[PDB]
Coordinates of C-alpha atoms in Angstrom, one line a residue:
Chain A
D1228 CA 14.8 -1.0 22.9
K1229 CA 17.0 -2.1 20.1
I1230 CA 15.9 -1.7 16.4
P1231 CA 17.7 -2.3 13.1
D1232 CA 20.2 0.2 12.0
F1233 CA 18.2 0.7 8.8
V1234 CA 15.0 1.8 10.6
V1235 CA 15.7 5.5 11.6
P1236 CA 13.7 8.1 13.4
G1237 CA 12.3 10.8 11.4
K1238 CA 10.9 11.2 7.7
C1239 CA 12.9 10.5 4.5
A1240 CA 15.1 13.4 3.7
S1241 CA 14.0 15.9 1.0
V1242 CA 16.5 15.5 -1.8
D1243 CA 16.1 18.0 -4.7
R1244 CA 14.7 15.4 -7.1
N1245 CA 13.6 17.8 -9.8
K1246 CA 17.2 19.1 -10.1
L1247 CA 18.7 15.6 -10.3
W1248 CA 16.1 14.5 -12.9
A1249 CA 16.7 17.3 -15.3
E1250 CA 20.4 16.8 -15.1
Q1251 CA 20.1 13.0 -15.5
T1252 CA 17.3 12.7 -18.1
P1253 CA 19.4 13.6 -21.2
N1254 CA 22.4 11.3 -20.1
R1255 CA 20.7 8.0 -19.6
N1256 CA 22.5 6.3 -22.2
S1257 CA 25.7 7.0 -20.4
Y1258 CA 24.5 5.4 -17.3
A1259 CA 24.2 2.1 -19.2
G1260 CA 26.8 -0.7 -19.2
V1261 CA 28.4 -2.5 -16.3
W1262 CA 28.4 -1.3 -12.7
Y1263 CA 30.0 -2.9 -9.6
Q1264 CA 28.5 -2.6 -6.2
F1265 CA 31.3 -1.2 -4.1
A1266 CA 29.5 -0.8 -0.9
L1267 CA 26.0 -0.7 0.5
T1268 CA 24.2 0.1 3.9
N1269 CA 22.6 -2.9 5.5
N1270 CA 20.0 -4.1 3.2
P1271 CA 17.7 -7.2 3.9
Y1272 CA 16.3 -7.4 0.4
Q1273 CA 19.5 -7.9 -1.6
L1274 CA 20.0 -11.6 -2.4
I1275 CA 23.4 -11.3 -3.8
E1276 CA 26.2 -11.1 -1.3
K1277 CA 29.6 -10.9 -3.0
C1278 CA 31.0 -10.0 -6.5
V1279 CA 27.7 -8.1 -7.3
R1280 CA 27.9 -6.9 -10.9
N1281 CA 25.0 -5.1 -12.5
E1282 CA 24.7 -4.9 -16.3
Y1283 CA 22.4 -2.2 -17.6
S1284 CA 21.0 -1.9 -21.1
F1285 CA 19.0 1.1 -22.0
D1286 CA 16.1 0.8 -24.6
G1287 CA 15.2 4.3 -24.8
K1288 CA 12.3 4.1 -22.2
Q1289 CA 13.9 2.1 -19.4
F1290 CA 16.9 0.1 -18.4
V1291 CA 16.8 -3.7 -18.3
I1292 CA 19.3 -5.0 -15.8
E1293 CA 21.0 -8.3 -15.3
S1294 CA 22.3 -8.5 -11.6
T1295 CA 24.8 -11.4 -10.9
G1296 CA 27.1 -12.5 -8.0
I1297 CA 27.4 -15.1 -5.2
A1298 CA 24.2 -15.5 -3.1
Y1299 CA 24.3 -15.9 0.7
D1300 CA 24.2 -19.7 0.3
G1301 CA 27.3 -19.5 -2.0
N1302 CA 25.8 -20.3 -5.3
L1303 CA 26.1 -18.0 -8.3
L1304 CA 22.8 -16.3 -8.8
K1305 CA 21.4 -14.1 -11.6
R1306 CA 18.4 -11.6 -10.9
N1307 CA 16.5 -9.8 -13.5
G1308 CA 15.6 -6.1 -12.8
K1309 CA 14.3 -3.0 -14.5
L1310 CA 14.7 0.7 -13.8
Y1311 CA 12.0 3.0 -15.3
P1312 CA 10.4 6.3 -14.4
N1313 CA 8.1 6.3 -11.5
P1314 CA 4.5 5.6 -12.9
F1315 CA 2.9 8.6 -11.2
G1316 CA 5.2 11.1 -12.9
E1317 CA 7.5 11.7 -9.9
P1318 CA 10.9 12.7 -10.8
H1319 CA 12.6 9.5 -9.7
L1320 CA 12.9 6.0 -11.0
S1321 CA 11.6 2.8 -9.8
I1322 CA 13.9 -0.1 -9.5
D1323 CA 12.0 -3.3 -9.8
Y1324 CA 13.2 -6.9 -9.6
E1325 CA 11.5 -10.0 -10.7
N1326 CA 9.8 -11.9 -7.8
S1327 CA 10.5 -9.0 -5.5
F1328 CA 9.1 -5.5 -5.1
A1329 CA 9.8 -2.1 -6.6
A1330 CA 11.2 0.8 -4.8
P1331 CA 12.1 4.5 -5.5
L1332 CA 15.7 5.1 -6.6
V1333 CA 17.5 8.4 -6.8
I1334 CA 20.9 8.8 -8.3
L1335 CA 22.4 11.4 -5.8
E1336 CA 25.5 12.0 -7.9
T1337 CA 27.4 10.2 -10.7
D1338 CA 30.0 11.0 -13.2
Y1339 CA 28.9 8.1 -15.3
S1340 CA 32.5 6.9 -16.1
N1341 CA 33.7 6.3 -12.5
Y1342 CA 31.2 6.2 -9.8
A1343 CA 27.4 6.6 -8.6
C1344 CA 25.9 7.1 -5.4
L1345 CA 22.4 5.9 -5.0
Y1346 CA 19.7 6.2 -2.4
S1347 CA 16.3 4.8 -1.9
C1348 CA 13.9 5.7 1.2
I1349 CA 10.6 4.6 2.4
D1350 CA 8.4 6.2 5.2
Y1351 CA 6.6 4.0 7.6
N1352 CA 3.2 4.9 9.4
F1353 CA 5.0 5.2 12.8
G1354 CA 7.4 8.1 12.6
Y1355 CA 10.4 6.3 11.2
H1356 CA 11.9 5.7 7.6
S1357 CA 14.2 3.1 6.2
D1358 CA 16.8 4.0 3.7
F1359 CA 19.2 2.0 1.6
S1360 CA 22.3 3.5 -0.1
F1361 CA 24.8 2.1 -2.6
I1362 CA 28.0 3.2 -4.0
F1363 CA 28.5 1.9 -7.5
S1364 CA 31.9 1.8 -9.5
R1365 CA 32.8 1.1 -13.0
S1366 CA 35.3 -1.3 -11.9
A1367 CA 36.0 -3.8 -9.2
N1368 CA 37.8 -1.2 -7.1
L1369 CA 37.0 2.5 -6.5
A1370 CA 39.6 5.1 -5.6
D1371 CA 39.4 7.0 -2.3
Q1372 CA 38.8 10.1 -4.2
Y1373 CA 35.5 8.8 -5.7
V1374 CA 34.5 7.2 -2.4
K1375 CA 34.7 10.6 -0.7
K1376 CA 32.4 12.3 -3.2
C1377 CA 29.7 9.7 -2.3
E1378 CA 30.4 10.1 1.4
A1379 CA 29.8 13.9 1.1
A1380 CA 26.6 13.3 -0.8
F1381 CA 25.2 10.9 1.7
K1382 CA 26.5 13.0 4.8
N1383 CA 24.5 15.8 3.3
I1384 CA 21.1 14.2 3.4
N1385 CA 22.0 13.1 6.9
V1386 CA 22.8 9.4 6.3
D1387 CA 25.3 7.9 8.8
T1388 CA 28.1 6.8 6.4
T1389 CA 29.4 4.5 9.1
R1390 CA 26.5 2.4 8.0
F1391 CA 28.4 1.4 4.9
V1392 CA 29.7 -2.2 4.3
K1393 CA 32.2 -2.9 1.6
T1394 CA 31.2 -5.7 -0.9
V1395 CA 33.7 -8.3 -1.9
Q1396 CA 35.0 -7.6 -5.5
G1397 CA 38.1 -8.4 -7.4
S1398 CA 40.1 -11.3 -9.1
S1399 CA 38.6 -13.8 -6.5
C1400 CA 35.2 -13.2 -8.3
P1401 CA 34.2 -15.4 -11.3
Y1402 CA 32.9 -12.4 -13.3
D1403 CA 33.5 -14.3 -16.7
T1404 CA 31.1 -17.0 -15.6
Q1405 CA 28.7 -14.6 -14.0
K1406 CA 28.3 -12.9 -17.5
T1407 CA 27.2 -16.2 -18.9
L1408 CA 24.3 -16.7 -16.5
Chain B
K1424 CA 11.9 -9.7 19.7
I1425 CA 10.7 -9.0 16.1
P1426 CA 7.5 -7.7 14.8
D1427 CA 4.6 -10.1 14.2
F1428 CA 4.7 -9.2 10.6
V1429 CA 8.3 -10.8 10.2
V1430 CA 7.7 -14.5 9.8
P1431 CA 10.0 -17.4 9.4
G1432 CA 10.7 -19.2 6.1
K1433 CA 9.9 -18.3 2.5
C1434 CA 6.8 -16.6 1.2
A1435 CA 4.1 -19.3 0.4
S1436 CA 3.5 -20.7 -3.0
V1437 CA -0.1 -19.4 -3.9
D1438 CA -1.2 -21.1 -7.3
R1439 CA -1.0 -17.7 -9.0
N1440 CA -1.6 -19.2 -12.6
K1441 CA -4.7 -20.6 -11.4
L1442 CA -6.0 -17.4 -10.0
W1443 CA -4.8 -15.2 -12.9
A1444 CA -6.9 -17.5 -15.3
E1445 CA -10.0 -16.9 -13.2
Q1446 CA -9.7 -13.3 -12.7
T1447 CA -8.4 -12.0 -16.0
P1448 CA -11.8 -12.1 -17.8
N1449 CA -13.5 -10.5 -14.8
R1450 CA -11.4 -7.5 -14.3
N1451 CA -14.2 -5.1 -15.0
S1452 CA -16.2 -6.5 -12.2
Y1453 CA -13.4 -5.7 -9.6
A1454 CA -13.9 -1.9 -10.1
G1455 CA -15.9 0.4 -8.0
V1456 CA -15.7 0.9 -4.3
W1457 CA -14.1 -1.3 -1.8
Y1458 CA -13.9 -0.8 2.0
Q1459 CA -11.0 -2.3 4.1
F1460 CA -12.7 -4.5 6.5
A1461 CA -9.6 -6.0 8.3
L1462 CA -5.9 -6.3 7.8
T1463 CA -2.8 -7.7 9.5
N1464 CA -0.3 -5.2 10.9
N1465 CA 1.1 -3.2 8.1
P1466 CA 3.7 -0.2 8.6
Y1467 CA 3.1 1.1 5.2
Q1468 CA -0.6 1.8 5.4
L1469 CA -1.0 5.5 6.1
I1470 CA -4.8 5.5 6.5
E1471 CA -6.0 4.3 9.8
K1472 CA -9.8 4.4 9.8
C1473 CA -12.7 4.7 7.3
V1474 CA -10.5 3.3 4.5
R1475 CA -12.4 3.4 1.4
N1476 CA -10.7 2.3 -1.8
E1477 CA -12.3 3.4 -5.3
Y1478 CA -11.1 1.6 -8.2
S1479 CA -11.5 2.4 -11.9
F1480 CA -10.4 0.0 -14.7
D1481 CA -9.1 1.6 -17.9
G1482 CA -8.5 -1.5 -19.9
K1483 CA -5.0 -2.1 -18.7
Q1484 CA -4.6 -1.2 -15.1
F1485 CA -6.7 0.1 -12.3
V1486 CA -6.4 3.6 -10.9
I1487 CA -7.2 3.9 -7.2
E1488 CA -8.3 6.7 -4.9
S1489 CA -7.9 5.6 -1.3
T1490 CA -9.5 7.8 1.4
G1491 CA -10.1 7.8 5.2
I1492 CA -8.6 9.2 8.6
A1493 CA -4.9 9.2 8.9
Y1494 CA -3.1 8.3 12.1
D1495 CA -2.9 11.8 13.1
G1496 CA -6.8 12.3 12.8
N1497 CA -6.8 14.1 9.6
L1498 CA -8.4 13.3 6.3
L1499 CA -6.0 11.8 3.8
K1500 CA -6.2 10.9 0.2
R1501 CA -3.7 8.6 -1.5
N1502 CA -3.4 7.8 -5.2
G1503 CA -2.6 4.2 -6.3
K1504 CA -2.3 2.0 -9.4
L1505 CA -2.9 -1.6 -9.7
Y1506 CA -1.2 -3.2 -13.0
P1507 CA 0.2 -6.5 -14.2
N1508 CA 3.7 -7.3 -12.8
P1509 CA 6.1 -5.8 -15.5
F1510 CA 8.1 -9.1 -15.8
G1511 CA 5.1 -10.9 -16.9
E1512 CA 4.5 -12.9 -13.8
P1513 CA 0.9 -13.8 -13.2
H1514 CA 0.3 -11.4 -10.4
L1515 CA -0.4 -7.5 -10.1
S1516 CA 1.7 -4.8 -8.6
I1517 CA 0.1 -2.3 -6.2
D1518 CA 1.9 1.1 -6.4
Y1519 CA 1.1 4.1 -4.4
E1520 CA 2.3 7.6 -4.8
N1521 CA 5.2 8.3 -2.8
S1522 CA 5.7 4.9 -1.7
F1523 CA 6.7 1.7 -3.2
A1524 CA 5.1 -1.1 -5.2
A1525 CA 4.6 -4.5 -4.1
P1526 CA 3.1 -7.8 -5.4
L1527 CA -0.6 -8.3 -4.8
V1528 CA -2.5 -11.6 -5.3
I1529 CA -6.4 -11.8 -5.0
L1530 CA -6.7 -15.0 -3.2
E1531 CA -10.5 -15.1 -3.6
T1532 CA -13.2 -12.8 -4.4
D1533 CA -16.9 -12.9 -5.5
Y1534 CA -16.7 -9.4 -7.0
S1535 CA -20.2 -8.4 -5.4
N1536 CA -19.4 -8.8 -1.7
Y1537 CA -15.7 -9.6 -0.6
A1538 CA -12.2 -9.9 -1.6
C1539 CA -9.2 -11.5 0.2
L1540 CA -6.0 -10.0 -0.8
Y1541 CA -2.3 -10.9 0.0
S1542 CA 1.2 -9.6 -0.5
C1543 CA 4.5 -11.2 0.4
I1544 CA 8.2 -10.1 0.4
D1545 CA 11.2 -12.4 1.2
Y1546 CA 14.2 -11.2 3.2
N1547 CA 17.7 -12.5 2.5
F1548 CA 17.9 -14.0 6.0
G1549 CA 15.3 -16.7 5.6
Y1550 CA 12.2 -14.8 6.9
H1551 CA 9.3 -13.0 5.1
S1552 CA 6.9 -10.4 5.7
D1553 CA 3.3 -10.8 4.4
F1554 CA 0.4 -8.3 4.5
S1555 CA -3.2 -9.5 4.2
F1556 CA -6.5 -7.6 3.7
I1557 CA -10.1 -8.4 3.7
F1558 CA -12.1 -5.9 1.5
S1559 CA -15.8 -5.7 1.4
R1560 CA -18.4 -3.8 -0.7
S1561 CA -19.9 -2.4 2.3
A1562 CA -18.9 -1.0 5.6
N1563 CA -19.7 -4.2 7.2
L1564 CA -19.2 -7.7 6.0
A1565 CA -21.4 -10.9 6.8
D1566 CA -19.8 -13.5 8.7
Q1567 CA -20.2 -16.0 6.0
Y1568 CA -17.8 -14.0 3.7
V1569 CA -15.3 -13.3 6.5
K1570 CA -15.1 -17.1 6.9
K1571 CA -14.3 -17.6 3.2
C1572 CA -11.4 -15.3 3.5
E1573 CA -10.3 -16.9 6.7
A1574 CA -10.3 -20.3 4.7
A1575 CA -8.2 -18.9 2.0
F1576 CA -5.6 -17.5 4.2
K1577 CA -5.4 -20.6 6.3
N1578 CA -4.8 -22.6 3.0
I1579 CA -1.6 -20.5 2.5
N1580 CA -0.5 -20.9 6.1
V1581 CA -1.3 -17.4 7.1
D1582 CA -2.1 -17.0 10.8
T1583 CA -5.5 -15.4 10.8
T1584 CA -5.4 -14.5 14.4
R1585 CA -3.1 -11.5 13.0
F1586 CA -6.1 -9.8 11.5
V1587 CA -7.5 -6.5 13.1
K1588 CA -10.8 -4.9 12.1
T1589 CA -10.6 -1.6 10.6
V1590 CA -13.1 1.1 11.9
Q1591 CA -16.0 1.7 9.3
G1592 CA -19.6 2.8 9.6
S1593 CA -21.4 5.6 11.3
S1594 CA -18.4 7.5 12.7
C1595 CA -17.0 7.8 9.0
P1596 CA -17.2 10.7 6.8
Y1597 CA -17.6 9.0 3.7
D1598 CA -19.5 11.8 1.9
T1599 CA -16.6 14.1 2.5
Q1600 CA -14.1 11.4 1.6
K1601 CA -15.8 11.0 -1.8
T1602 CA -15.1 14.6 -2.4
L1603 CA -11.3 14.6 -1.8

């Protein structure tokens, strides 16, 4: 039987969240600014297809996010999000978007000034999980040397990195318009 | 051949503002114990049988302790919260430990006997998944109340033939559950 490639046998991987939380908590401000989605694994919840540009502002307690790009129907779209600590005190963040749902998000690795590797995972009641991974860049392109760092990080928690698909970015994108939305 | 909980089209419009206006003043009456009477197929629900949800309202949100028999036959406790949607939208978020948070609308409730609850998420490919529940204040629920819920789901075009009854009653260790 065929199932989607983002439904995978087994339980979500462990991820040493307490380590990452302690490393990231004092650096929150540095995570703010603009991040471009360089690539992601197949994700049925993402409404923005191309030129995905995420603007993060940090208010000391959470990040407010303005995500923009071209939707699957070819129109420009702006979505409003928030990233805040998980409400039960677990050492991870919730990413929540307006008119959507919220999901756990771990920053598996970032150097803050070039790239970030992101990960979210959900267990089902029937012996499978679904995970969603992103590679984020501070610019429209990202050098092979940083892509490999994410690839290693994902490979290490057992994610099939052949699942990554590159997002359209670059001078074909109307970034100046997107920022006015 | 897709799961019966992946449905064509966009999530339904549900008159959330009308609901919110009704329920806001009555939040305290929504606390206490609610049994899951029936639900549509849900892959995120870890508790299979004897599902008992205890709600406490602290003024801003509800704190939830959900208990019952897991799919492996063991007893399970899950901690949840229910709070206003953080963007200011007129609905609630239901959020469970080591899970995710989803929008939750109470389509109808009389507080003393039943509640009909609904959650919907849209996909980028033109389909949605919705999850529906019938809650009761007792292990059983009279027919007249089930029917009110069936009417409310029908009104939003949910196919009520998707509902399955949850095991409750004699076979359940509620006394032990209360203890977890």
